[PDB]
């Protein structure tokens, strides 16, 4: 079937839409080629629509069915509870989009009588009505990038009203937080902290006689997902032990929301109909992860690849296996791609087999190595820092709701760029406005978190260990990528950052505790006299459990 159908009516914005990085003394200190940085807008919506709208070919076989049953067997071990209204309400972000029926996120979070009663209605409606399609809104995402030597069109997000999103959580939060791990086991990506992810990739790599590995980029995954795929995904959820009201909710949400529905623009006009994954519902991450894992797992058998270990994060996929010789590896990977095409998951760019772990890009990241205080090799996780930096400039010049910089500091703390540029730049600013204490919103695996910068030393210690404060002797491939990037974007070269860092470090020391602890630990790479570095005195229990991208989750 057609992934989408369009009435012709436009995909509209609901506010002013900003697209150019402004000239600001704060952002210009970080990066100077301001005309290279842009945000996507709805002005580019039609270009995306063209890309996402197509006919899907899908043909299932024995291998598909075989893996599906294996997955269903493990799903049967799961007991899942209903959240109460209170729990589901406490999971709603404070800046989540308001309802059409006269209540917002603040009301939901307070359990105001109005929100609560509409939530009860929507739920009872899900128990009573098993067919009527449920309305969605469609909007062009605002995202920041650097120009390519050639712009990206905005992404399209699609989501139901707030009353439904609370009901999704009641019915499905426990499932989408526990079912993926029981089914995929060590292949479920979102269980791993960055240090744990690198551990798993290195251990898996070093466990093979002759490793070969590849990433596989599916072309616009959400549009490849068929109605069949979403019913199959429901067949997995239904293997859980569920309360009756849960089971019916899941059934109605599947037929009325997840498989498709009408699309409405911001002006209340009808844009079209959807027959694929919606980016903006609770089950997208779980569902995409399961679906990716299922097709890829079956395609591996079809391709005859040997001793496969896969690692899956929604629609991001990486596979490590036993080489069969370079040319036999190439023909097997091509068989794999073709199997996936049949399962309705064709490639964006053809995958290439790799024989050096550092050359594989999964979740926009790659493994690299450095050395700690005592000279031991420490494997860490990094990426091309262009987008982080472009966004960091943008978030310095403009107030955004989510601060990608802070999320990038946490995730990439041990990296060369995050340490010398991000920490330096942002801590210098927070000092100068006396806002070190103030908590800021960031995203980790799609969930929203309110973190305060003064907690970054211990957060980084837990997530990465003391070494993220003492790494040195980075590889030249990595130093070269960073240095080039900076020249391209007009970011000052690293020696400038070193000097700015020393000035910032000295200022944090002459402050107090905590602040000085930032100075001591975060900026020990800058100072002349190297320092002690003992563990730091000071709940991270729910941080790397599951993915929630598009799922409207706050913790």
Author numbering: 1 to 149, 153 to 541, 546 to 562
What are the paper's exact sentences on this?
The X-ray crystal structure of quercetagetin bound to the HCV RdRp was solved by means of soaking experiments in apo crystals of NS5BΔ21. The structure displayed the typical right-hand shape of an RNA polymerase, with the palm, thumb and fingers subdomains organized around a central cleft defining the active site. Quercetagetin was found to bind to the fingers and C-terminal domains of HCV RdRp, at the entrance of the RNA template tunnel. The B ring of quercetagetin was clearly apparent in the electron density maps, whereas the orientation of the A and C rings was proposed based on partial density only, because this part of the molecule adopted several conformations. The structure showed that quercetagetin binds closely to residues D559, G557, G283, R168, F162, I160, A97 and S96, with its B ring within a 2.9–4.0 Å distance of these amino acids, making a π-stacking interaction with the side chain of F162 and one hydrogen bond with G283. That was the case of the strictly conserved G283 residue which interacts with the 2′-hydroxyl of the template RNA ±1 ribose and makes a hydrogen bond with the B ring of quercetagetin, and of the highly conserved F162 residue which stacks both the sugar of the RNA template pairing nucleotide and the B ring of quercetagetin at its top. Superimposition of our crystallographic structure with the recently published crystallographic structure of HCV NS5B in complex with primer-template RNA suggested that quercetagetin interferes with the ability of the enzyme to interact with RNA. Altogether, these results indicate that quercetagetin inhibits RNA binding to the HCV RdRp through a direct interaction with the enzyme. No change was observed for S96A and G557A, whereas susceptibility of the D559 variant was reduced 7-fold in the enzyme assay. Due to the conservation of the residues at the quercetagetin binding site across HCV genotypes, this new NNI binding site has the potential for pangenotypic activity.
